[model samples]
Target: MFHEFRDEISVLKANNPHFDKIFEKHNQLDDDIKTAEQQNASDAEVSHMKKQKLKLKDEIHSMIIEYREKQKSERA
Candidate 1:
């Protein structure tokens, strides 16, 4: 997950508390989602968990975008 953005994530996690929490939740969600798959959970259950995971992913991406903007502003 987001392997290319690894460094940015590490830096952001150190600098941003909210981002760190979200990142942690996202990681946990991945584990839960994987377990649900292995257990052959119902489609609805899996989909619901996936949706929640996607929301967390979107939030994390938004934080990364914000960090990029901050970097640009600091340079200017």
Candidate 2:
């Protein structure tokens, strides 16, 4: 499911390259979360990674919304 979301993120990045950095962070956080589970990392560490993941995703979403709003205004 996330890989599919990653693909969508890739396409969105093409539309706005500035998002790439945040998206990369987002991807890393996701990987870390996955790795933590796979390796049975500490609960605290996993929780921290999950928080980072949400933060990264939030940053990307905020930027995407900003971009969309700009486009909307452009159509005016």
Candidate 3:
């Protein structure tokens, strides 16, 4: 996903428990969604999972932005 914040993602995944949990859930959902697609699961079920994944992605992106801003201010 957030390719631009690769370093931030790594740091948060290691240092932040809440972020790690959400990240893990996001990854799990990604895998599950793929599997569901391969197995020809219902569109409704896959769509629901995609929505949850997107929500997590948004939270993760926000956290990365917040972390980057914090870092900038700290440097300042």
Candidate 4:
């Protein structure tokens, strides 16, 4: 989702097992949400799924920022 951090995400997905799992779950939720929408699922159901996806997205974003900061500090 964070297209700007695409490279960092790839690195994290390859190197960090926890991050890889969360990232995969986030993508799965995205696909599920879309399918639910197409299938006309209840609003509450879709919203709940979206909330879960957002939580994962936030975690991923924070991890990416942390990773970038670490890289910067190491380079310095």
Better of 2 and 3 by lDDT: 3
Ten-residue stretch with the least lDDT total in model 3: 11-20
Model 2 clashing residue pairs (backbone): none
Tell me the deviation in Å of residue 7 in model 1.
4.6
Task: Find the candidate with the highest TM-score and give its number.
Answer: 2
Per-residue C-alpha lDDT of model 1 across residues 17-70, encoded as one tens digit per residue: 885588778877877778888884788887778887888787777787877788
lDDT of 4: 0.75
Q: Please provide, for model 3 over 2-73, each residue's C-alpha lDDT reduced to its tens digit, 9 standing for 90 to 100.
A: 665776776775368776687787778888788877875799988887887778677776787777788789
Which residue pairs clash within candidate 3?
none
Report, for every candidate in turn, its global Cα lDDT versus the true structure.
0.75, 0.72, 0.75, 0.75
lDDT of 3 at 31: 85
- State candidate 1's TM-score: 0.72
Q: Candidate 4's residue-wise lDDT over 1-76, tens digit each?
A: 5764777776775358776677777778888888877875789888887887778678776787777888789875
Model 4 compared with the native: what TM-score? 0.70
**Looking at candidate 1, what is the lDDT of residue 44?**
83
